[PDB]
Amino acid sequence: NAMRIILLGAPGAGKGTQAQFIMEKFGIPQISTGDMLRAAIKAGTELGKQAKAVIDAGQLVSDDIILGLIKERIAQADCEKGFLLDGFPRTIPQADGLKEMGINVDYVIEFDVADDVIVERMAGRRAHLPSGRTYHVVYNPPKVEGKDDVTGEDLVIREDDKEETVRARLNVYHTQTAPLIEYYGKEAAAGKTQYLKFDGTKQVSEVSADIAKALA
Amino acid sequence: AMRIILLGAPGAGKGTQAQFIMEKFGIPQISTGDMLRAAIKAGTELGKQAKAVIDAGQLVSDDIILGLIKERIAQADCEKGFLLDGFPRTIPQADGLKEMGINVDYVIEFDVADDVIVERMAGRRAHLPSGRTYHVVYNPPKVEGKDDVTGEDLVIREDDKEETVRARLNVYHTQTAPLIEYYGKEAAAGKTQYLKFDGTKQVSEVSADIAKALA
């Protein structure tokens, strides 16, 4: 058989831990829309070119450009058993595009972790600006609070990590995602796809469990 | 066949000529980070291996990076050559390559004075939540200090201010200096062609000379 999944979840919710689990468990690669495209431009593929031409000129990348990569990405040999789409489609026409290019998804999984949780998580992040080395006050502390483990120089909390900024970020995702939730929730209700929501504050081992249970 | 190493300060926009060369000469730009991030997401045996290091809070080791590049450059698109951007960063990494028989035809040192980089950086403006990136001299918003889309405020990223930039740059050269002598020594022997270009100059003008050189 084959296995294709779309994956949604909030910026900072840390969904990648389960992408990489799905990866291992089902053996299907990760395709970041942003990485796949970054790769192409730097590799100078036909599509990396075309994109890179649009970019240079400061213009908006056509969707026809994007589905092609994905048509080429899933045309990679590593996708034989399927794949995982991370935070894509981002729009209804992208939902439609996938379909109209022969990509019809088995499961749509949504990793939700309350906004409020995520902000406190971002808030723990520190960094050292001259070297860009990062820290988190819980998940991986410096050996000393406030100080860079390599230069002994003080740490900062990035601005983009702060509530104001993360909160702004969060509202856009929600604002953008809701119709896809709505779109595929509509697909799923009509058995077109299976839509699944997981509590991402349960321990990884736990979430990983339920996830496997569903995908039987 | 022509193999190439790009050396250049962060933000001096070496990436800019790295794309010229690829366009002009048809060889891919190879970024270790990117190459590394992609193996992880593809979950290659090595990508898998490397991912484990990260979750352990450790650095990825040379053998793994070297094994990824080995993997990269054996790919179809590299038959006529490739551009290494962001590697090697150590002498052992440098020796690592040579062992594997990496036949660098040119080492290219992209140079912009510190003070020029500072002023370059001094012009970047960010809209924090999207990470979109304006620039007052090279790429301004529709509206001054305002985000075209949202109409939000653009900030002067703390990351782009002088104390840090020169801090960063300072570190940059201490690290890089030994590669320069390393490749200076190699060139001395003849094992590669060492080149150097002033990046303070305009791009199409810089790209021009590069092409002449690699003719």
Chain A within 8 Å of B213 (Cβ-Cβ)? no
- How far apart, in Å, do the first and last CA atoms of chain A sit? 12
What b/e readout covers B46-82, taking b as 16+ CB neighbours within 10 angstroms? bbebbbeeeeeeeebeeebbbbbbeebbeeeebeebb
Domains of chain B (ranges plus CATH)?
1-215 (3.40.50.300)
Chain A within 8 Å of B158 (Cβ-Cβ)? yes
Taking the CA of residue B196 and the nearest CA in chain A, the distance in Å comes to 22
Position A127: which residue type?
A: A
Strand (E) positions, chain B? 3-8, 29-31, 83-85, 104-111, 124-127, 132-135, 193-198
Sequence-distant (≥ 6) Cβ neighbours of residue B177 within 8 angstroms:
none
Rounded to an integer, what distance in angstroms lies between the CA atom of residue A71 and that of residue A67?
6
Q: Which residues of B are catalytic?
A: 14, 89, 124, 157, 168
State whether B26 and A44 contact (CB < 8 Å): yes
- Could you write out the three-class secondary structure of B157-182? CHHHCHHHHHHHHHHHHHHHHHHHHH
State whether B38 and A39 contact (CB < 8 Å): yes
CA angle, residues B80, B90, B14, in degrees to nearest 5: 55
Which CA distances in Å does A91 have to A52, A101, B60, B163? 22, 15, 36, 41
Instruction: Report CA Rg, chain B.
Output: 19
Residue pair B160/B121 in contact (Cβ under 8 Å)? The answer is yes
Residue pair B202/B15 in contact (Cβ under 8 Å)? The answer is no
Q: Comparing C-alpha atoms, which of B155, B121, B98 is closest to residue B10?
A: B121
Helix (H) or strand (E) holding B100, with range, is: helix B91-100
Chain B within 8 Å of A42 (Cβ-Cβ)? yes
Q: Comparing C-alpha atoms, which of B105, B112, B68 is closest to residue B86?
A: B68
State whether A35 and B31 contact (CB < 8 Å): no
Which CA distances in Å does B142 have to A174, A215, B7, B147, B160? 26, 48, 34, 8, 21
State whether B128 and A160 contact (CB < 8 Å): yes
Helix (H) or strand (E) holding A194, with range, is: strand A194-199
State whether A42 and B51 contact (CB < 8 Å): no
Residue of A nearest to B54 (CA): A140
Residue of B nearest to A165 (CA): B129
φ/ψ (deg, to 5) at A179: -75, -20
Q: Of A42, A140, A169, which has the smallest distance from its Cβ to B29's Cβ?
A: A42
Strand (E) positions, A98-179? 107-112, 125-128, 133-136
Which CA distances in Å does B80 have to B1, B16, B72, B103? 5, 21, 13, 12
User: Which residues of chain B have a CB within 8 Å of the CB of A23?
Assistant: 43
State whether A44 and B22 contact (CB < 8 Å): yes
User: Which residues of chain B have a CB within 8 Å of the CB of A39?
Assistant: 34, 38
Position B82: which residue type?
A: F
Residue pair A47/A67 in contact (Cβ under 8 Å)? The answer is no
Distance of CA A24 to the CA centre of its chain: 17
* Token duo for residue B205: 């003008």
Longest dimension (CA), chain B: 57
Which CA distances in Å does B89 have to A69, B35, B78, B103? 31, 15, 21, 17
Residue pair A68/A47 in contact (Cβ under 8 Å)? The answer is yes
Residue pair B15/B85 in contact (Cβ under 8 Å)? The answer is yes
Rounded to an integer, what distance in angstroms lies between the CA atom of residue A181 and that of residue A176?
10
Give the residue from B128, B138, B142 with the most A CB atoms within 10 Å of its CB, the best one to mutate.
B128
Helix (H) or strand (E) holding B94, with range, is: helix B91-100
Within 10 A of A76 (CB to CB), how many other CB atoms are there?
A: 12
Residue pair A106/A76 in contact (Cβ under 8 Å)? The answer is no
Sequence-distant (≥ 6) Cβ neighbours of residue B43 within 8 angstroms:
A20, A23, A24, A27, A29, A30, B51
Question: Which resolution in angstroms does this entry have?
Answer: 2.0
Rounded to an integer, what distance in angstroms lies between the CA atom of residue B209 and that of residue B109?
13
φ/ψ (deg, to 5) at B153: -80, 140
User: Which residues of chain B have a CB within 8 Å of the CB of A30?
Assistant: 40-43
Rounded to 10 degrees, what is the CA torsion of A53, A57, A63, A67?
Answer: 20
What b/e readout covers B8-20, taking b as 16+ CB neighbours within 10 angstroms? bbbbbbbbebbbb
Residue of A nearest to B40 (CA): A30
* Token duo for residue B24: 């002009």
In this structure, the strands spanning B104-111 and B193-198 are parallel
Helix (H) or strand (E) holding A121, with range, is: helix A115-122
What b/e readout covers A171-195, taking b as 16+ CB neighbours within 10 angstroms? eebeeebeebbebbbebeeeeebbb
Q: Of A35, A131, A169, which has the smallest distance from its Cβ to B38's Cβ?
A: A35
Which CA distances in Å does A135 have to A19, A90, A139, A181? 23, 30, 8, 33
Within 10 A of A87 (CB to CB), how many other CB atoms are there?
A: 19
Rounded to an integer, what distance in angstroms lies between the CA atom of residue A39 and that of residue B84?
14
In this structure, the strands spanning A133-136 and A125-128 are antiparallel
Rounded to an integer, what distance in angstroms lies between the CA atom of residue B29 and that of residue A43?
6
Strand-pairing partners, residue A32, are A86
- Could you write out the three-class secondary structure of A9-49? ECCCCCCHHHHHHHHHHHHCCEEEHHHHHHHHHHHCCHHHH
Rounded to an integer, what distance in angstroms lies between the CA atom of residue A150 and that of residue A132?
12
Strand-pairing partners, residue A196, are A109
Helices A163-189/A92-99 angle, 10° precision: 40
Residue of A nearest to B164 (CA): A130
* Token duo for residue A36: 């796949």
